[PDB]
Write a protein that binds this ligand. Structure first.
Ligand SMILES: O[C@@H]1[C@@H](O)[C@H](O[C@@H]2CO[C@@H](O)[C@H](O)[C@H]2O)OC[C@H]1O
Length: 185
């Protein structure tokens, strides 16, 4: 499918050279950053969407995630489906596991306090995570069957909000450097 949303957010720290390429393609070169999220996807997320991507380059030198990323409002929730990472594997409060698209993911919940959100300003919100147990190899056509994650989260009392915001296949980083090139469809 054609992507219709371009996400390019940085808190202003360091260098974040994000390129909005042709179709669903984008690349990022980052150096000595603060927090940032770059990615392509859809303006309105869906719990039924099947996301396809191919990360031609996934080369983080530090803390960075290659992850499905999105938000819902009512309640405000930031969610992730992490396929690969750099030096740090994100974890939180363990809820259980889900097998999807050839991999096994651990399910975690964390909370952010006085942090930036899609609404602007700062607030406290919950984060839902599905983190692969082992890094998924990159360079190949990968699929994330999002429904499997949504259903598993629900079975663990992790309900998403009623108002869906954007949903993208992103490159997130925190105080690191690196490069990525990803195509989303
Ligand atoms: O849409 C943008 C959001 O992506 C941003 O929220 C931060 C995203 O990075 C995560 O690591 C943080 O938890 C989260 O605060 O807020 C700005 C908004 O424009």
């Amino acid at each position: 499918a054609s992507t219709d949303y371009w996400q390019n957010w940085t808190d202003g720290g360091g260098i974040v050279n994000a390129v909005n390429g042709s179709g669903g393609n984008y690349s990022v070169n980052w150096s000595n950053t603060g927090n940032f999220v770059v990615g392509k996807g859809w303006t309105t997320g869906s719990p039924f969407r099947t996301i396809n991507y191919n990360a031609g380059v996934w080369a983080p030198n530090g803390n960075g995630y290659l992850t499905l990323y999105g938000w819902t409002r009512s309640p405000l929730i930031e969610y992730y489906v992490v396929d690969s990472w750099g030096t740090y594997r994100p974890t939180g409060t363990y809820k259980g596991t889900v097998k999807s698209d050839g991999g096994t993911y651990d399910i975690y919940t964390t909370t952010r306090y006085n942090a930036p959100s899609i609404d602007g300003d700062r607030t406290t919100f919950t984060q839902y995570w599905s983190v692969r147990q082992s890094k998924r190899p990159t360079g190949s056509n990968a699929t994330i069957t999002f429904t499997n994650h949504v259903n598993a989260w629900k079975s663990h009392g992790m309900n998403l909000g009623s108002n869906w915001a954007y949903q993208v296949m992103a490159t997130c980083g925190y105080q690191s450097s690196g490069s990525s090139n990803v195509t989303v469809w």
